[PDB]
Coordinates of N, CA and C in Angstrom, one line a residue:
Chain A
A1 N 79.6 -18.5 -5.5 CA 80.8 -17.6 -5.4 C 81.7 -17.8 -6.6
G2 N 82.4 -18.9 -6.6 CA 83.1 -19.4 -7.8 C 82.0 -20.0 -8.6
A3 N 81.0 -20.5 -8.0 CA 79.8 -20.9 -8.7 C 79.2 -19.8 -9.5
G4 N 79.1 -18.6 -8.9 CA 78.6 -17.4 -9.5 C 79.4 -17.0 -10.7
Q5 N 80.7 -17.0 -10.6 CA 81.6 -16.7 -11.8 C 81.4 -17.6 -12.9
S6 N 81.2 -18.9 -12.7 CA 81.1 -19.8 -13.7 C 79.8 -19.6 -14.5
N7 N 78.8 -19.3 -13.7 CA 77.5 -19.0 -14.3 C 77.6 -17.8 -15.2
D8 N 78.1 -16.7 -14.6 CA 78.3 -15.5 -15.4 C 79.1 -15.7 -16.6
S9 N 80.2 -16.5 -16.5 CA 81.0 -16.8 -17.7 C 80.1 -17.5 -18.7
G10 N 79.2 -18.4 -18.3 CA 78.4 -19.2 -19.1 C 77.3 -18.3 -19.8
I11 N 76.8 -17.3 -19.1 CA 75.8 -16.4 -19.6 C 76.4 -15.5 -20.7
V12 N 77.6 -15.0 -20.4 CA 78.4 -14.2 -21.4 C 78.7 -14.9 -22.6
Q13 N 79.2 -16.2 -22.5 CA 79.4 -17.1 -23.6 C 78.1 -17.2 -24.4
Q14 N 77.0 -17.4 -23.7 CA 75.7 -17.6 -24.3 C 75.3 -16.3 -25.1
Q15 N 75.6 -15.2 -24.7 CA 75.3 -14.0 -25.4 C 76.1 -13.9 -26.7
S16 N 77.4 -14.3 -26.6 CA 78.3 -14.4 -27.8 C 77.7 -15.3 -28.8
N17 N 77.2 -16.5 -28.4 CA 76.6 -17.5 -29.2 C 75.4 -16.9 -29.9
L18 N 74.5 -16.3 -29.2 CA 73.3 -15.7 -29.8 C 73.6 -14.6 -30.8
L19 N 74.5 -13.8 -30.5 CA 75.0 -12.7 -31.3 C 75.5 -13.3 -32.6
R20 N 76.3 -14.4 -32.5 CA 76.8 -15.1 -33.7 C 75.7 -15.6 -34.6
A21 N 74.7 -16.2 -33.9 CA 73.5 -16.8 -34.6 C 72.7 -15.7 -35.4
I22 N 72.5 -14.6 -34.7 CA 71.8 -13.4 -35.4 C 72.6 -12.9 -36.5
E23 N 73.9 -12.9 -36.4 CA 74.8 -12.4 -37.5 C 74.6 -13.3 -38.7
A24 N 74.7 -14.6 -38.5 CA 74.6 -15.6 -39.6 C 73.2 -15.5 -40.3
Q25 N 72.2 -15.2 -39.4 CA 70.8 -15.1 -40.0 C 70.7 -13.9 -40.8
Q26 N 71.4 -12.8 -40.4 CA 71.4 -11.6 -41.2 C 71.9 -11.9 -42.6
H27 N 73.0 -12.7 -42.7 CA 73.5 -13.0 -44.0 C 72.6 -13.8 -44.8
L28 N 71.9 -14.8 -44.1 CA 70.8 -15.5 -44.8 C 69.7 -14.6 -45.3
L29 N 69.3 -13.6 -44.5 CA 68.3 -12.6 -44.9 C 68.8 -11.9 -46.2
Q30 N 70.0 -11.4 -46.2 CA 70.5 -10.7 -47.4 C 70.6 -11.6 -48.6
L31 N 70.9 -12.9 -48.4 CA 70.8 -13.8 -49.5 C 69.4 -14.0 -50.1
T32 N 68.4 -14.0 -49.2 CA 67.0 -14.1 -49.6 C 66.6 -12.8 -50.4
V33 N 67.0 -11.7 -49.9 CA 66.7 -10.4 -50.5 C 67.3 -10.4 -52.0
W34 N 68.6 -10.9 -52.1 CA 69.2 -11.0 -53.4 C 68.3 -11.9 -54.4
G35 N 67.9 -13.0 -53.9 CA 67.1 -13.9 -54.7 C 65.7 -13.3 -55.1
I36 N 65.1 -12.6 -54.2 CA 63.8 -11.9 -54.5 C 64.0 -10.8 -55.5
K37 N 65.1 -10.1 -55.3 CA 65.5 -9.0 -56.2 C 65.8 -9.5 -57.6
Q38 N 66.4 -10.7 -57.7 CA 66.7 -11.3 -59.0 C 65.4 -11.7 -59.8
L39 N 64.4 -12.2 -59.0 CA 63.1 -12.5 -59.6 C 62.3 -11.2 -59.9
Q40 N 62.2 -10.3 -58.9 CA 61.4 -9.1 -59.1 C 61.9 -8.3 -60.3
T41 N 63.2 -8.1 -60.3 CA 63.8 -7.4 -61.4 C 63.5 -8.0 -62.8
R42 N 63.5 -9.3 -62.8 CA 63.3 -10.1 -64.1 C 61.8 -10.2 -64.4
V43 N 61.0 -10.6 -63.4 CA 59.6 -10.8 -63.6 C 58.8 -9.5 -63.6
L44 N 58.9 -8.8 -62.5 CA 58.1 -7.6 -62.3 C 58.6 -6.3 -62.8
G45 N 59.9 -6.1 -62.8 CA 60.4 -4.7 -62.8 C 60.0 -4.1 -61.5
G46 N 59.3 -3.0 -61.4 CA 59.1 -2.2 -62.6 C 59.4 -0.8 -62.0
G47 N 59.3 -0.7 -60.7 CA 59.6 0.5 -59.9 C 58.4 0.9 -59.1
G48 N 58.6 1.7 -58.0 CA 57.6 2.4 -57.3 C 57.3 1.8 -55.9
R49 N 56.4 0.8 -55.9 CA 56.2 0.0 -54.6 C 57.5 -0.8 -54.3
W50 N 58.2 -1.3 -55.3 CA 59.4 -1.9 -55.1 C 60.6 -1.0 -54.7
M51 N 60.4 0.3 -55.1 CA 61.4 1.3 -54.6 C 61.1 1.5 -53.1
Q52 N 59.9 1.5 -52.7 CA 59.5 1.5 -51.3 C 60.1 0.3 -50.6
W53 N 59.9 -0.8 -51.2 CA 60.4 -2.1 -50.6 C 62.0 -2.0 -50.4
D54 N 62.7 -1.6 -51.5 CA 64.1 -1.5 -51.4 C 64.6 -0.6 -50.3
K55 N 63.9 0.6 -50.2 CA 64.4 1.5 -49.1 C 64.0 0.9 -47.7
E56 N 62.9 0.3 -47.6 CA 62.5 -0.4 -46.4 C 63.4 -1.5 -46.0
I57 N 63.8 -2.3 -46.9 CA 64.9 -3.3 -46.7 C 66.1 -2.6 -46.2
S58 N 66.6 -1.5 -46.9 CA 67.8 -0.8 -46.6 C 67.7 -0.3 -45.2
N59 N 66.6 0.4 -44.8 CA 66.4 1.0 -43.5 C 66.6 -0.1 -42.4
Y60 N 65.8 -1.2 -42.5 CA 65.9 -2.2 -41.5 C 67.2 -2.9 -41.5
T61 N 67.9 -3.1 -42.7 CA 69.2 -3.7 -42.7 C 70.1 -2.9 -41.9
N62 N 70.0 -1.6 -42.1 CA 70.9 -0.7 -41.4 C 70.7 -0.7 -39.9
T63 N 69.4 -0.7 -39.5 CA 69.3 -0.8 -38.0 C 69.8 -2.1 -37.4
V64 N 69.6 -3.2 -38.1 CA 70.3 -4.5 -37.7 C 71.8 -4.3 -37.6
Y65 N 72.4 -3.8 -38.6 CA 73.8 -3.5 -38.6 C 74.2 -2.7 -37.4
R66 N 73.5 -1.7 -37.1 CA 73.9 -0.8 -36.1 C 73.7 -1.5 -34.7
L67 N 72.6 -2.3 -34.6 CA 72.4 -3.1 -33.5 C 73.5 -4.1 -33.3
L68 N 73.9 -4.8 -34.3 CA 75.0 -5.8 -34.2 C 76.3 -5.1 -33.8
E69 N 76.6 -3.9 -34.3 CA 77.8 -3.2 -33.9 C 77.7 -2.8 -32.4
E70 N 76.6 -2.3 -32.0 CA 76.4 -1.9 -30.6 C 76.5 -3.2 -29.8
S71 N 76.0 -4.3 -30.2 CA 76.1 -5.6 -29.5 C 77.5 -6.1 -29.4
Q72 N 78.2 -6.0 -30.5 CA 79.7 -6.3 -30.5 C 80.4 -5.5 -29.5
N73 N 80.2 -4.2 -29.4 CA 80.9 -3.4 -28.5 C 80.5 -3.8 -27.0
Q74 N 79.2 -4.1 -26.8 CA 78.8 -4.4 -25.5 C 79.4 -5.8 -25.1
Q75 N 79.5 -6.7 -26.1 CA 80.1 -8.0 -25.8 C 81.5 -7.8 -25.3
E76 N 82.3 -7.0 -26.0 CA 83.7 -6.9 -25.5 C 83.8 -6.3 -24.2
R77 N 82.9 -5.3 -23.9 CA 82.9 -4.6 -22.6 C 82.5 -5.7 -21.5
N78 N 81.5 -6.5 -21.8 CA 81.1 -7.5 -20.9 C 82.2 -8.5 -20.6
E79 N 82.9 -8.9 -21.7 CA 83.9 -9.9 -21.5 C 85.1 -9.3 -20.7
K80 N 85.4 -8.0 -21.0 CA 86.4 -7.4 -20.2 C 86.0 -7.4 -18.7
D81 N 84.8 -7.0 -18.4 CA 84.3 -6.9 -17.1 C 84.3 -8.2 -16.4
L82 N 83.9 -9.3 -17.1 CA 83.9 -10.6 -16.6 C 85.3 -11.0 -16.1
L83 N 86.3 -10.6 -16.9 CA 87.7 -11.0 -16.7 C 88.3 -10.2 -15.5
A84 N 87.7 -9.1 -15.1 CA 88.2 -8.3 -14.0 C 87.6 -8.8 -12.6
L85 N 86.7 -9.7 -12.7 CA 86.0 -10.3 -11.5 C 87.0 -11.0 -10.6
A86 N 86.8 -10.7 -9.3 CA 87.6 -11.3 -8.2 C 87.5 -12.8 -8.1
Chain B
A1 N 81.9 -7.1 -6.8 CA 80.8 -6.6 -6.0 C 80.1 -5.5 -6.7
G2 N 80.7 -4.3 -6.7 CA 80.3 -3.3 -7.6 C 80.7 -3.7 -9.0
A3 N 81.8 -4.5 -9.1 CA 82.2 -5.1 -10.3 C 81.0 -6.0 -10.8
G4 N 80.4 -6.8 -9.9 CA 79.3 -7.7 -10.2 C 78.1 -7.0 -10.8
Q5 N 77.7 -5.9 -10.2 CA 76.6 -5.1 -10.6 C 76.8 -4.5 -12.0
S6 N 78.0 -4.1 -12.3 CA 78.3 -3.5 -13.6 C 78.2 -4.5 -14.7
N7 N 78.7 -5.7 -14.4 CA 78.7 -6.8 -15.3 C 77.2 -7.2 -15.6
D8 N 76.4 -7.4 -14.5 CA 75.0 -7.7 -14.6 C 74.3 -6.7 -15.5
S9 N 74.6 -5.4 -15.2 CA 74.0 -4.3 -16.0 C 74.3 -4.4 -17.5
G10 N 75.6 -4.8 -17.7 CA 76.1 -5.0 -19.1 C 75.4 -6.2 -19.8
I11 N 75.2 -7.3 -19.0 CA 74.5 -8.4 -19.6 C 73.0 -8.1 -19.9
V12 N 72.4 -7.4 -19.0 CA 71.0 -7.0 -19.2 C 70.8 -6.1 -20.4
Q13 N 71.8 -5.1 -20.5 CA 71.8 -4.2 -21.7 C 72.0 -5.1 -22.9
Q14 N 72.9 -6.1 -22.8 CA 73.1 -7.0 -24.0 C 71.9 -7.7 -24.4
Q15 N 71.1 -8.2 -23.5 CA 69.8 -8.9 -23.8 C 68.9 -7.9 -24.6
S16 N 68.8 -6.7 -24.1 CA 68.0 -5.7 -24.8 C 68.4 -5.5 -26.2
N17 N 69.7 -5.3 -26.4 CA 70.4 -5.2 -27.7 C 69.9 -6.4 -28.6
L18 N 70.1 -7.6 -28.1 CA 69.8 -8.8 -29.0 C 68.3 -8.9 -29.3
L19 N 67.5 -8.5 -28.3 CA 66.0 -8.5 -28.5 C 65.7 -7.5 -29.6
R20 N 66.3 -6.3 -29.6 CA 66.1 -5.3 -30.6 C 66.5 -5.8 -31.9
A21 N 67.6 -6.5 -32.0 CA 68.1 -7.1 -33.3 C 67.1 -8.1 -33.9
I22 N 66.7 -9.0 -33.0 CA 65.7 -10.0 -33.5 C 64.4 -9.4 -34.0
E23 N 64.0 -8.3 -33.3 CA 62.8 -7.6 -33.7 C 62.9 -7.0 -35.1
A24 N 64.0 -6.3 -35.3 CA 64.3 -5.7 -36.6 C 64.4 -6.8 -37.7
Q25 N 64.9 -7.9 -37.4 CA 65.1 -9.0 -38.3 C 63.7 -9.6 -38.6
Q26 N 62.8 -9.6 -37.7 CA 61.5 -10.1 -37.9 C 60.8 -9.2 -38.9
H27 N 61.0 -7.9 -38.8 CA 60.4 -6.9 -39.8 C 61.0 -7.2 -41.2
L28 N 62.3 -7.4 -41.3 CA 63.0 -7.8 -42.5 C 62.3 -9.1 -43.1
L29 N 62.1 -10.1 -42.2 CA 61.4 -11.3 -42.7 C 60.1 -11.1 -43.3
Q30 N 59.3 -10.2 -42.6 CA 58.0 -9.9 -43.1 C 58.0 -9.2 -44.5
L31 N 59.0 -8.3 -44.6 CA 59.3 -7.6 -45.9 C 59.6 -8.6 -47.0
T32 N 60.5 -9.7 -46.7 CA 60.8 -10.7 -47.7 C 59.5 -11.6 -48.0
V33 N 58.7 -11.9 -47.0 CA 57.5 -12.6 -47.3 C 56.6 -11.8 -48.2
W34 N 56.4 -10.5 -48.0 CA 55.7 -9.6 -48.9 C 56.2 -9.7 -50.3
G35 N 57.5 -9.6 -50.6 CA 58.0 -9.7 -51.9 C 57.8 -11.0 -52.6
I36 N 57.9 -12.1 -51.8 CA 57.7 -13.5 -52.3 C 56.3 -13.6 -52.7
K37 N 55.4 -13.1 -51.8 CA 53.9 -13.1 -52.1 C 53.6 -12.4 -53.3
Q38 N 54.2 -11.2 -53.6 CA 54.0 -10.4 -54.8 C 54.4 -11.2 -56.0
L39 N 55.4 -11.9 -56.0 CA 55.9 -12.7 -57.1 C 55.0 -14.0 -57.3
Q40 N 54.8 -14.7 -56.2 CA 54.0 -16.0 -56.2 C 52.6 -15.7 -56.7
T41 N 52.0 -14.7 -56.2 CA 50.6 -14.3 -56.6 C 50.6 -13.9 -58.1
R42 N 51.6 -13.2 -58.6 CA 51.7 -12.8 -60.0 C 52.1 -14.0 -60.9
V43 N 53.2 -14.6 -60.6 CA 53.7 -15.7 -61.4 C 53.0 -17.0 -61.3
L44 N 52.9 -17.5 -60.0 CA 52.4 -18.8 -59.8 C 50.9 -19.0 -59.5
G45 N 50.3 -18.0 -58.9 CA 49.0 -18.2 -58.3 C 49.3 -19.1 -57.1
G46 N 48.8 -20.2 -57.0 CA 47.6 -20.6 -57.7 C 46.6 -21.1 -56.6
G47 N 47.3 -21.5 -55.5 CA 46.6 -22.1 -54.3 C 47.1 -23.5 -54.0
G48 N 46.9 -23.9 -52.7 CA 47.1 -25.3 -52.3 C 48.4 -25.4 -51.5
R49 N 49.5 -25.7 -52.1 CA 50.8 -25.8 -51.5 C 51.1 -24.4 -50.9
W50 N 50.8 -23.4 -51.7 CA 51.0 -22.0 -51.2 C 50.0 -21.6 -50.1
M51 N 48.9 -22.3 -50.0 CA 48.0 -22.1 -48.8 C 48.7 -22.7 -47.6
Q52 N 49.3 -23.8 -47.8 CA 50.1 -24.5 -46.7 C 51.2 -23.5 -46.3
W53 N 51.9 -22.9 -47.3 CA 53.0 -22.0 -47.1 C 52.5 -20.8 -46.2
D54 N 51.4 -20.2 -46.7 CA 50.8 -19.0 -46.0 C 50.5 -19.3 -44.6
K55 N 49.8 -20.5 -44.3 CA 49.5 -20.8 -42.9 C 50.8 -21.1 -42.1
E56 N 51.7 -21.7 -42.7 CA 53.0 -22.0 -42.1 C 53.8 -20.8 -41.7
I57 N 53.8 -19.8 -42.6 CA 54.4 -18.5 -42.3 C 53.6 -17.9 -41.2
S58 N 52.3 -17.9 -41.2 CA 51.5 -17.3 -40.2 C 51.8 -17.9 -38.8
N59 N 51.7 -19.2 -38.8 CA 52.0 -20.0 -37.5 C 53.3 -19.5 -36.9
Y60 N 54.4 -19.6 -37.7 CA 55.7 -19.2 -37.2 C 55.8 -17.8 -36.9
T61 N 55.2 -16.9 -37.7 CA 55.2 -15.5 -37.4 C 54.6 -15.3 -36.0
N62 N 53.5 -16.0 -35.8 CA 52.8 -15.8 -34.5 C 53.7 -16.3 -33.3
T63 N 54.3 -17.4 -33.5 CA 55.2 -17.9 -32.3 C 56.3 -16.9 -32.1
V64 N 56.9 -16.3 -33.2 CA 57.9 -15.3 -32.9 C 57.4 -14.1 -32.2
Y65 N 56.2 -13.6 -32.6 CA 55.5 -12.5 -31.9 C 55.3 -12.8 -30.5
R66 N 54.8 -14.0 -30.2 CA 54.5 -14.4 -28.8 C 55.8 -14.4 -28.0
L67 N 56.9 -15.0 -28.6 CA 58.2 -15.0 -28.0 C 58.7 -13.6 -27.8
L68 N 58.6 -12.8 -28.7 CA 59.1 -11.4 -28.5 C 58.3 -10.7 -27.4
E69 N 57.0 -10.9 -27.3 CA 56.2 -10.4 -26.2 C 56.7 -10.9 -24.9
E70 N 56.8 -12.2 -24.8 CA 57.3 -12.8 -23.6 C 58.7 -12.2 -23.2
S71 N 59.5 -12.1 -24.2 CA 60.9 -11.5 -24.1 C 60.8 -10.1 -23.6
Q72 N 59.9 -9.3 -24.1 CA 59.7 -7.9 -23.7 C 59.3 -7.9 -22.2
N73 N 58.4 -8.7 -21.8 CA 58.0 -8.8 -20.4 C 59.1 -9.2 -19.5
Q74 N 59.9 -10.2 -20.0 CA 61.0 -10.7 -19.2 C 62.1 -9.6 -19.1
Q75 N 62.3 -8.8 -20.2 CA 63.2 -7.8 -20.1 C 62.9 -6.7 -19.0
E76 N 61.6 -6.3 -19.0 CA 61.2 -5.3 -18.0 C 61.4 -5.8 -16.6
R77 N 61.1 -7.1 -16.4 CA 61.2 -7.7 -15.1 C 62.7 -7.7 -14.7
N78 N 63.6 -8.0 -15.7 CA 65.0 -8.1 -15.4 C 65.5 -6.8 -15.0
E79 N 65.1 -5.8 -15.8 CA 65.6 -4.4 -15.6 C 65.1 -3.9 -14.2
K80 N 63.9 -4.3 -13.8 CA 63.4 -3.9 -12.5 C 64.2 -4.5 -11.4
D81 N 64.5 -5.8 -11.6 CA 65.3 -6.5 -10.6 C 66.7 -6.1 -10.5
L82 N 67.3 -5.6 -11.6 CA 68.6 -5.1 -11.7 C 68.7 -3.8 -10.8
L83 N 67.6 -3.0 -10.9 CA 67.6 -1.7 -10.3 C 67.3 -1.8 -8.8
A84 N 66.8 -3.0 -8.3 CA 66.6 -3.2 -6.9 C 67.9 -3.7 -6.2
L85 N 68.9 -4.0 -7.0 CA 70.1 -4.6 -6.4 C 70.8 -3.6 -5.5
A86 N 71.3 -4.2 -4.4 CA 72.0 -3.4 -3.3 C 73.4 -2.8 -3.8
Chain C
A1 N 71.4 -10.6 -3.1 CA 71.8 -11.9 -2.7 C 70.8 -12.9 -3.2
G2 N 69.6 -13.0 -2.5 CA 68.5 -13.7 -3.1 C 68.0 -12.9 -4.3
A3 N 68.2 -11.5 -4.1 CA 67.9 -10.6 -5.2 C 68.8 -11.0 -6.4
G4 N 70.1 -11.3 -6.2 CA 71.0 -11.8 -7.2 C 70.6 -13.0 -7.9
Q5 N 70.1 -14.0 -7.2 CA 69.7 -15.3 -7.8 C 68.5 -15.1 -8.7
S6 N 67.5 -14.2 -8.2 CA 66.3 -14.0 -9.0 C 66.7 -13.3 -10.3
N7 N 67.6 -12.4 -10.3 CA 68.1 -11.7 -11.4 C 68.7 -12.7 -12.4
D8 N 69.6 -13.5 -11.9 CA 70.3 -14.5 -12.7 C 69.3 -15.4 -13.3
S9 N 68.3 -15.9 -12.6 CA 67.3 -16.8 -13.1 C 66.5 -16.1 -14.2
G10 N 66.3 -14.8 -14.1 CA 65.6 -14.0 -15.1 C 66.4 -13.8 -16.3
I11 N 67.7 -13.6 -16.2 CA 68.6 -13.5 -17.3 C 68.7 -14.8 -18.1
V12 N 68.9 -15.9 -17.4 CA 68.9 -17.3 -18.0 C 67.6 -17.6 -18.7
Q13 N 66.5 -17.3 -18.1 CA 65.2 -17.4 -18.7 C 65.2 -16.6 -20.0
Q14 N 65.7 -15.4 -19.9 CA 65.7 -14.5 -21.1 C 66.6 -15.0 -22.3
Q15 N 67.7 -15.7 -21.9 CA 68.5 -16.3 -23.0 C 67.7 -17.5 -23.7
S16 N 66.9 -18.2 -22.9 CA 66.1 -19.3 -23.4 C 65.1 -18.7 -24.4
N17 N 64.4 -17.6 -24.0 CA 63.5 -16.9 -24.8 C 64.1 -16.5 -26.1
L18 N 65.2 -15.8 -26.1 CA 65.9 -15.3 -27.3 C 66.3 -16.5 -28.2
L19 N 66.8 -17.6 -27.6 CA 67.2 -18.7 -28.4 C 66.0 -19.3 -29.1
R20 N 64.8 -19.4 -28.4 CA 63.6 -19.8 -29.0 C 63.2 -19.0 -30.1
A21 N 63.3 -17.6 -30.0 CA 62.9 -16.7 -31.0 C 63.8 -16.9 -32.3
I22 N 65.1 -17.0 -32.1 CA 66.0 -17.2 -33.2 C 65.7 -18.5 -33.9
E23 N 65.3 -19.6 -33.2 CA 65.0 -20.9 -33.7 C 63.7 -20.8 -34.7
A24 N 62.7 -20.1 -34.2 CA 61.5 -19.9 -35.0 C 61.8 -19.0 -36.2
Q25 N 62.7 -18.1 -36.1 CA 63.0 -17.2 -37.2 C 63.8 -18.0 -38.2
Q26 N 64.6 -19.0 -37.8 CA 65.3 -19.9 -38.7 C 64.3 -20.7 -39.5
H27 N 63.2 -21.1 -38.9 CA 62.2 -21.9 -39.7 C 61.5 -20.9 -40.7
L28 N 61.2 -19.7 -40.2 CA 60.7 -18.7 -41.2 C 61.6 -18.5 -42.4
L29 N 62.9 -18.4 -42.1 CA 63.9 -18.2 -43.1 C 63.9 -19.4 -44.1
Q30 N 63.8 -20.6 -43.6 CA 63.8 -21.8 -44.5 C 62.5 -21.8 -45.3
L31 N 61.4 -21.4 -44.8 CA 60.1 -21.2 -45.5 C 60.3 -20.2 -46.6
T32 N 60.9 -19.1 -46.4 CA 61.2 -18.1 -47.5 C 62.1 -18.6 -48.5
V33 N 63.1 -19.4 -48.1 CA 64.0 -20.0 -49.1 C 63.2 -20.9 -50.0
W34 N 62.4 -21.8 -49.4 CA 61.5 -22.6 -50.2 C 60.7 -21.9 -51.2
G35 N 60.0 -20.8 -50.9 CA 59.2 -20.0 -51.8 C 60.0 -19.4 -52.9
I36 N 61.2 -18.9 -52.6 CA 62.1 -18.3 -53.6 C 62.6 -19.4 -54.5
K37 N 62.9 -20.6 -54.0 CA 63.3 -21.7 -54.8 C 62.2 -22.1 -55.8
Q38 N 60.9 -22.1 -55.3 CA 59.8 -22.4 -56.1 C 59.6 -21.5 -57.3
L39 N 59.8 -20.2 -57.0 CA 59.8 -19.2 -58.1 C 61.0 -19.3 -59.0
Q40 N 62.2 -19.3 -58.4 CA 63.4 -19.4 -59.2 C 63.5 -20.6 -60.2
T41 N 63.1 -21.7 -59.6 CA 63.1 -23.0 -60.4 C 62.1 -22.9 -61.5
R42 N 61.0 -22.3 -61.3 CA 59.9 -22.1 -62.3 C 60.2 -21.0 -63.3
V43 N 60.5 -19.8 -62.8 CA 60.7 -18.6 -63.6 C 62.1 -18.6 -64.3
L44 N 63.1 -18.8 -63.5 CA 64.5 -18.6 -63.9 C 65.3 -19.8 -64.4
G45 N 65.0 -21.0 -63.7 CA 65.9 -22.1 -63.8 C 67.1 -21.6 -63.0
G46 N 68.3 -21.5 -63.6 CA 68.6 -22.2 -64.8 C 69.9 -22.9 -64.4
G47 N 70.5 -22.4 -63.4 CA 71.8 -23.0 -62.9 C 72.9 -21.9 -62.9
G48 N 73.9 -22.2 -62.0 CA 75.2 -21.4 -62.0 C 75.3 -20.4 -60.9
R49 N 74.8 -19.2 -61.1 CA 74.7 -18.2 -60.0 C 73.8 -18.7 -58.9
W50 N 72.7 -19.4 -59.3 CA 71.8 -20.0 -58.4 C 72.4 -21.2 -57.7
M51 N 73.3 -21.9 -58.3 CA 74.1 -22.9 -57.6 C 74.9 -22.3 -56.5
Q52 N 75.5 -21.2 -56.8 CA 76.3 -20.4 -55.8 C 75.4 -20.1 -54.7
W53 N 74.2 -19.6 -55.0 CA 73.2 -19.1 -54.1 C 72.8 -20.3 -53.2
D54 N 72.4 -21.5 -53.8 CA 72.1 -22.7 -53.1 C 73.2 -23.1 -52.1
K55 N 74.4 -23.1 -52.5 CA 75.5 -23.5 -51.6 C 75.7 -22.5 -50.5
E56 N 75.6 -21.2 -50.8 CA 75.7 -20.1 -49.9 C 74.6 -20.2 -48.8
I57 N 73.4 -20.4 -49.2 CA 72.3 -20.7 -48.3 C 72.6 -21.9 -47.4
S58 N 73.0 -23.0 -48.0 CA 73.4 -24.2 -47.3 C 74.4 -23.9 -46.2
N59 N 75.5 -23.3 -46.6 CA 76.6 -23.0 -45.7 C 76.2 -22.2 -44.5
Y60 N 75.4 -21.1 -44.8 CA 74.9 -20.3 -43.7 C 73.9 -21.0 -42.8
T61 N 73.0 -21.8 -43.5 CA 72.0 -22.5 -42.7 C 72.8 -23.4 -41.8
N62 N 73.8 -24.1 -42.3 CA 74.5 -25.0 -41.4 C 75.2 -24.3 -40.2
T63 N 75.9 -23.1 -40.5 CA 76.4 -22.4 -39.3 C 75.4 -22.0 -38.3
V64 N 74.2 -21.6 -38.7 CA 73.1 -21.3 -37.8 C 72.7 -22.5 -37.0
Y65 N 72.6 -23.6 -37.7 CA 72.3 -24.9 -37.0 C 73.3 -25.2 -36.0
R66 N 74.6 -25.1 -36.3 CA 75.7 -25.4 -35.4 C 75.7 -24.5 -34.2
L67 N 75.4 -23.2 -34.5 CA 75.3 -22.2 -33.5 C 74.1 -22.5 -32.6
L68 N 73.0 -22.8 -33.1 CA 71.8 -23.2 -32.3 C 72.1 -24.4 -31.4
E69 N 72.8 -25.4 -32.0 CA 73.2 -26.6 -31.2 C 74.1 -26.2 -30.0
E70 N 75.1 -25.4 -30.3 CA 76.1 -25.0 -29.3 C 75.3 -24.2 -28.3
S71 N 74.4 -23.3 -28.7 CA 73.6 -22.5 -27.8 C 72.7 -23.4 -26.9
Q72 N 72.1 -24.4 -27.5 CA 71.3 -25.3 -26.7 C 72.1 -26.0 -25.6
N73 N 73.3 -26.5 -26.0 CA 74.2 -27.1 -25.0 C 74.6 -26.1 -23.9
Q74 N 74.9 -24.9 -24.3 CA 75.3 -23.8 -23.3 C 74.1 -23.5 -22.4
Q75 N 72.9 -23.5 -23.0 CA 71.7 -23.2 -22.2 C 71.5 -24.3 -21.1
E76 N 71.7 -25.5 -21.4 CA 71.5 -26.6 -20.4 C 72.5 -26.5 -19.3
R77 N 73.8 -26.2 -19.7 CA 74.9 -26.0 -18.8 C 74.6 -24.8 -17.9
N78 N 74.0 -23.7 -18.4 CA 73.8 -22.6 -17.6 C 72.7 -22.8 -16.6
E79 N 71.7 -23.6 -17.1 CA 70.5 -23.9 -16.2 C 70.9 -24.8 -15.1
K80 N 71.8 -25.7 -15.4 CA 72.3 -26.6 -14.4 C 73.1 -25.8 -13.4
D81 N 74.0 -24.9 -13.8 CA 74.8 -24.1 -12.9 C 74.0 -23.2 -12.1
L82 N 72.9 -22.6 -12.7 CA 71.9 -21.8 -11.9 C 71.3 -22.5 -10.8
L83 N 71.0 -23.8 -11.0 CA 70.3 -24.6 -10.0 C 71.2 -25.1 -8.9
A84 N 72.5 -25.0 -9.1 CA 73.5 -25.4 -8.1 C 73.8 -24.3 -7.2
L85 N 73.3 -23.1 -7.5 CA 73.6 -21.8 -6.7 C 73.1 -21.9 -5.3
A86 N 73.9 -21.5 -4.4 CA 73.6 -21.5 -2.9 C 72.4 -20.6 -2.6

C-alpha cells in the first residue's frame, strides 16, 4: 500500500535514470559521428554513399530526438500522476 | 485506484518509449560502425586487431539484439497484463 | 491485486532489460571510439580539437557510467521493494 507507492516512486525514478542515460549516450553518438565525419571528409571525401549516410544519420538522429521529447513529456506526466497518489 | 491504473499505463507507455529510443540508437550505432569500417578498410586494412574489433562489435551487437527481443516480448506481456487490470 | 503484483514484476523486469541494453550499447560506443581513435591517431594526429573531442568523450562516458551505477542501485532497491510486497 505505502509499500506500493514507494515501489512506484522507485520505478518512476528508474525511468528518469534510464532516460538520462539514453540522452548522454545520444551525445556520445553525435561526438562519434563528428569524428567519423572529420576523417571521412579528410580521407574519403567524396560524396554519394556518404550523402546517403549523412541523411540516414540525420533521419535516425531526429527520431531519437522526437522519442526523447516524447519520453520527457511522458516522464513529467508520470511524475505528476505519482504525486497525486493517495 | 483509477489513479493507480493511469500511472501504471503511463509507466508502461514510458517503457515502450525508451525501448523505441534504444532501438533507434542501435541503428545509429550500426551506421557509425559502417562509416568506421569504410575508413578502416580503406586507410588501415589490414587485419588482426581489426578482426578482434569486428568480432567484438558482432558479439555486442548480438547481445543488444537479444536484449531488444527479450524487451519486446516483455513489453507485450506487460501491455497484456495492464489491459487485464480491474 | 495479484494482477497488480504480476504487472509490477513485469515492469521491474523490463527496467532490468533496458538497463542491460543500455550497458551493452555503452560497450559498443566505446568500441567505436577505439576505432575512430585508431584512425584519427594514424591519419590526422594531431592534437587540439581532438583533445577537446577526447575530453568530451571522457566527460560523457563518465556521466553514463555514473548514471548506470545509479540505475543499478535503483534497480536493486526496486527489486527489494517488489519482493516485500504483500
